[PDB]
Amino acid sequence: LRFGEMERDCMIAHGAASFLKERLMEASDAFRVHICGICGLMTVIAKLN
Amino acid sequence: GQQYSSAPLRTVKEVQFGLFSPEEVRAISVAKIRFPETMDETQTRAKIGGLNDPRLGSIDRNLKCQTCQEGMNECPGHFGHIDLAKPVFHVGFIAKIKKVCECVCMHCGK
Amino acid sequence: PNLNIVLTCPECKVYPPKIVERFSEGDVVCALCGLVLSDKLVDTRSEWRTFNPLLDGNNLSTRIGKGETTDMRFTKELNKAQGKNVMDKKDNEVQAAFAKITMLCDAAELPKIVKDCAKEAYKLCHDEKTLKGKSMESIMAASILIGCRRAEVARTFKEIQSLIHVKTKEFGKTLNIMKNILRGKSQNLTYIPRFCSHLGLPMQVTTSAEYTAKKCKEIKEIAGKSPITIAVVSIYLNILLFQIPITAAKVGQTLQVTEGTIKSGYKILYEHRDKLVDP
Amino acid sequence: SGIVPTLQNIVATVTLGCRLDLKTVALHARNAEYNPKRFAAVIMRIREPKTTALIFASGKMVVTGAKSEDDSKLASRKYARIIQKIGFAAKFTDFKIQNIVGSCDVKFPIRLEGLAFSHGTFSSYEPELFPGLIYRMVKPKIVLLIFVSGKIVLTGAKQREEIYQAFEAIYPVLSEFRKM
Amino acid sequence: TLKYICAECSSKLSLSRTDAVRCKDCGHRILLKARTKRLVQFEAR
Ligand SMILES: [Zn+2]
Ligand SMILES: [Zn+2]
Ligand SMILES: [Zn+2]
Ligand SMILES: [Zn+2]
Numbered sequence: 001l002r003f004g005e006m007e008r009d010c011m012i013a014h015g016a017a018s019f020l021k022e023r024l025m026e027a028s029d030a031f032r033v034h035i036c037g038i039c040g041l042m043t044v045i046a047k048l049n
Numbered sequence: 050g051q052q053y054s055s056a057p058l059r060t061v062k063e064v065q066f067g068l069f070s071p072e073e074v075r076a077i078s079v080a081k082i083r084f085p086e087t088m089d090e091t092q093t094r095a096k097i098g099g100l101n102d103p104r105l106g107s108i109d110r111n112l113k114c115q116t117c118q119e120g121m122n123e124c125p126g127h128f129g130h131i132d133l134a135k136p137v138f139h140v141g142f143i144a145k146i147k148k149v150c151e152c153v154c155m156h157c158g159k
Numbered sequence: 160p161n162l163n164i165v166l167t168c169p170e171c172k173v174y175p176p177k178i179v180e181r182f183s184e185g186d187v188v189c190a191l192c193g194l195v196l197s198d199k200l201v202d203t204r205s206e207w208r209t210f211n212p213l214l215d216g217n218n219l220s221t222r223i224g225k226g227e228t229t230d231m232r233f234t235k236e237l238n239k240a241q242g243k244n245v246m247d248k249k250d251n252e253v254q255a256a257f258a259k260i261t262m263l264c265d266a267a268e269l270p271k272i273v274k275d276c277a278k279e280a281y282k283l284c285h286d287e288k289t290l291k292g293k294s295m296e297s298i299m300a301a302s303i304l305i306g307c308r309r310a311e312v313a314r315t316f317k318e319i320q321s322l323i324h325v326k327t328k329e330f331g332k333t334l335n336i337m338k339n340i341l342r343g344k345s346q347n348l349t350y351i352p353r354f355c356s357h358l359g360l361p362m363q364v365t366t367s368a369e370y371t372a373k374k375c376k377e378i379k380e381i382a383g384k385s386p387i388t389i390a391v392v393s394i395y396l397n398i399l400l401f402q403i404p405i406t407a408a409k410v411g412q413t414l415q416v417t418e419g420t421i422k423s424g425y426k427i428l429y430e431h432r433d434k435l436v437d438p
Numbered sequence: 439s440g441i442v443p444t445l446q447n448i449v450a451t452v453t454l455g456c457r458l459d460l461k462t463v464a465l466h467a468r469n470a471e472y473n474p475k476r477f478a479a480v481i482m483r484i485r486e487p488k489t490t491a492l493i494f495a496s497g498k499m500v501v502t503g504a505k506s507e508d509d510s511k512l513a514s515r516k517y518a519r520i521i522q523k524i525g526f527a528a529k530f531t532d533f534k535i536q537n538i539v540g541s542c543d544v545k546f547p548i549r550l551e552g553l554a555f556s557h558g559t560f561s562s563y564e565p566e567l568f569p570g571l572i573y574r575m576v577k578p579k580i581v582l583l584i585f586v587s588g589k590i591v592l593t594g595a596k597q598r599e600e601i602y603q604a605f606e607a608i609y610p611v612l613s614e615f616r617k618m
Numbered sequence: 619t620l621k622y623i624c625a626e627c628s629s630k631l632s633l634s635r636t637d638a639v640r641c642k643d644c645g646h647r648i649l650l651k652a653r654t655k656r657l658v659q660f661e662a663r
Contacts, residue, residue, distance in 0.1 A: 331567055336562075339559065339562050347566075386565075
């Protein structure tokens with residue numbers, strides 16, 4: 001189901017900042033990525049193994 | 050799920066926009082893209098230096114992105130580059146070029 | 160490199176593993192312990208739900224034209240900049256082959272499957288010393304006959320000869336090599352019904368001929384030198400078994416056959432009339 | 439085998455060594471068919487040995503219809519003698535048979551369908567123009583035409599001997615593919 | 619092979635795989651599929 005733009009606003013008016021976050025990252029598509037600390041570009045070649 | 054890494058986890062505090070220097074592209078790029086072919090010339094895996102070589106990211110949930118490793122759900126995809134034969138306008142800036150040229154001598158640059 | 164991924168339950172490990180994909184959960188699970196191996200499965204029908212490499216390969220294409228917001232001093236040059244790289248590609252002779260054969264099989268009133276096999280049968284051979292030109296017809300005249308028969312629809316050489324005049328000879332040599340092209344890369348029944356309809360007959364007259372022609376074929380009577388003829392005689396055999404006016408002269412031109420092969424072919428029939436008695 | 443490949447035509451080349459006046463060659467002959475509108479070669483049929491030959495402005499003669507190496511050879515020697523009677527010093531020099539085509543029979547009905555189908559790679563068939571199979575051998579390099587009547591048309595050799603060898607090789611195939 | 623039924627001729631057919639999809643007695647090209655034999659249970663609720 002869609003968490004629309006207006007649902008986002010209604011959640012802001014409630015002030016529920018954490019739910020707004022969880023509903024937007026945990027509940028949809030979080031993604032860890034690495035970034036260079038100099039050129040802040042997702043260009044790190046992580047061999048995290 | 051997602052495998053443990055070690056880089057310290059932070060949160061973004063600032064975005065600095067800004068254009069892209071052609072040197073920067075080349076320094077980033079992992080591959081010189083040359084041949085319009087996608088697949089390998091033998092109807093098999095993929096043309097190296099082709100329009101998606103394996104050194105760019107990979108998909109199929111079955112391969113490893115030989116640049117940075119396996120997970121199709123870890124690799125963010127790595128950028129490759131093409132160097133044009135001759136330079137061209139970037140559509141977003143034609144107006145901001147025509148405007149600019151009208152503000153500087155077209156001979157000395159001042 | 161080997162660039163390869165395999166899943167296996169690291170806490171059972173017993174196998175090339177026994178795992179199942181629970182799609183509606185986006186999971187793969189060890190069918191033994193139920194450890195979920197990998198998740199966030201990506202859809203597999205919605206992908207093409209929103210929507211030819213066997214021919215068009217890897218050199219891709221895109222139809223470039225004129226939008227609403229362009230004047231003719233930019234539109235026609237898109238028609239004058241697209242023309243600089245049509246000879247580095249032999250693909251004109253690739254596509255204009257298909258376009259031609261598409262223009263052919265379609266004008267020929269043929270099933271769109273044959274169109275593909277001919278869009279194939281060109282593309283597979285597409286240049287050989289055996290080909291070395293040879294009028295570029297005979298292939299599109301045989302690769303169709305290939306594409307036709309290979310698609311289980313058989314048509315006579317004259318029938319295609321009607322579509323394309325191939326001198327009847329450039330056809331023959333081109334066919335032999337072509338067939339052997341695939342053999343290295345590796346059925347006259349079809350004529351009975353198409354003929355009956357050409358005469359506008361009910362099914363039984365055609366129904367019977369399949370028995371008769373097969374039975375006339377099955378025992379003896381090699382009979383015919385291109386059995387096209389000895390097909391029709393079955394109709395003539397069976398039409399006379401019925402009493403419907405398809406008089407010999409009407410048969411001939413309708414099916415473009417010699418009359419002589421009929422009666423002499425019917426000689427072996429006015430004598431063999433013994434064993435075709437089904438009812 | 440037990441079957442001799444029976445030659446029906448031998449085509450051979452003979453260098454008479456002179457630029458023959460094909461007009462005078464046609465004029466001084468007894469029954470010779472030469473007019474430039476078909477070929478640049480006088481064609482003569484000699485009944486003994488009965489051979490048909492085309493002799494060009496180069497003086498080179500190609501002979502056909504012979505039933506032997508010696509039929510063609512003796513016919514060509516007679517041809518050179520005829521040319522010399524015409525007036526040109528024809529000579530039998532560097533003769534070579536360029537073709538020996540024969541027809542014989544193995545006489546047992548053949549599963550030609552089996553051969554062609556299983557030897558599609560080697561033999562091709564479109565039985566709606568001509569009912570014969572085409573087969574190839576490199577050692578010896580003989581091409582063989584096969585028909586259900588048992589007729590074997592062996593071609594592709596300067597000698598009847600390659601005909602014989604490939605026939606000794608192909609008759610066993612025929613008996614193997616013998617329909618019954 | 620399995621039973622079939624012509625759509626119009628309405629004759630049991632029993633063809634197999636790699637037979638023509640075609641009716642005897644009328645070269646009609648539509649066949650039904652000769653309903654199952656195992657019993658089937660409903661509730662009169
Ligand atoms: Zn950096
Ligand atoms: Zn990667
Ligand atoms: Zn200046
Ligand atoms: Zn397990």
